[PDB]
């Protein structure tokens, strides 16, 4: 979901 996470 978050573009900076996984």
């Amino acid at each position, epitope marked *: 979901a*978050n*573009p*900076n*996470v*996984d």
Partner: antibody
Framework: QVKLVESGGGVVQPGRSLRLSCEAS????????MHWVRQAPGKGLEWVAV????????YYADSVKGRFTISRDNSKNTVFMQMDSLRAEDTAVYYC?????????????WGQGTLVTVSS | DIQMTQSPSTLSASVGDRVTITCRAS??????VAWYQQKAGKAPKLLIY???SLESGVPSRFSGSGSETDFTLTISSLQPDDVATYYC?????????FGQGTKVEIKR
């Protein structure tokens, strides 16, 4: 390891242009994005711009919209920021910055910054 | 974008005192908040990520809590080496926004 080296700072006349670069080492800019974060003398940190590894997802802060242009070299591991119509409020240390999070943990790195002085 | 409001602006405390710093987001950022420490003349350093998790090497006296819109950074035992400015930050999306910063001074 990972290092980010900014270059291009120095004095620049008000209303003129200046080009910053950030050379990235110890990793490939093939994932996530790269940020520019600036800090005026004695003031707080201010995020300025972001670019993704493939040139997409470009966003600017309202304070620099229409004047700054962030881009990456398609041939090297380097990102640029063209800064036009500079004013006294743009005087700041400019940091190259990379941040993301994996299952391995956080990946957070900062250059030592380059000082842009908007002066006559 | 999302606005981050940090407080206090400045504080001084004695060695071993508990330091409390709060940040507010203008809208829900879930738990995508990070806390940075910046010492005089140096680049910022990540201390806390995802509101509560500690970056490698960060001493255990640093902790974080909160969710959605209200978050807190706590130094349980202020040390002379903790004299710096601290910044909250949200990373919900592609960009970032920082809080105004809290300068932490020490009494001796």
């Amino acid at each position: 390891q990972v290092k980010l080296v900014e270059s291009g700072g120095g004095v620049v006349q008000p209303g003129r242009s200046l080009r910053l670069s950030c050379e990235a080492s110890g990793f490939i800019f093939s994932t996530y994005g790269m940020h520019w974060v600036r800090q005026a003398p004695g003031k707080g940190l201010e995020w300025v711009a972001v670019i993704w590894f493939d040139g997409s997802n470009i966003y600017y802060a309202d304070s620099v919209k229409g004047r700054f242009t962030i881009s990456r070299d398609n041939s090297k591991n380097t990102v640029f920021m063209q800064m036009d119509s500079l004013r006294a409020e743009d005087t700041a240390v400019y940091y190259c910055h990379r941040n993301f999070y994996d299952g391995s943990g956080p990946f957070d790195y900062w250059g030592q910054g380059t000082l842009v002085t908007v002066s006559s | 974008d999302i606005q981050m409001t940090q407080s206090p602006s400045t504080l001084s405390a004695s060695v071993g005192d508990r330091v409390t710093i709060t940040c507010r987001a203008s809208q829900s950022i879930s738990r995508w908040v990070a806390w940075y420490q910046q010492k005089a003349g140096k680049a910022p350093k990540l201390l806390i990520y995802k509101a509560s998790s500690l970056e490698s090497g960060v001493p255990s006296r640093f902790s974080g809590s909160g969710s959605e819109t209200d978050f807190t950074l706590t130094i349980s035992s202020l040390q002379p080496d903790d004299v710096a400015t601290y910044y909250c930050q949200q990373y919900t999306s592609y960009g970032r926004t920082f809080g105004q910063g809290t300068k932490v001074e020490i009494k001796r």
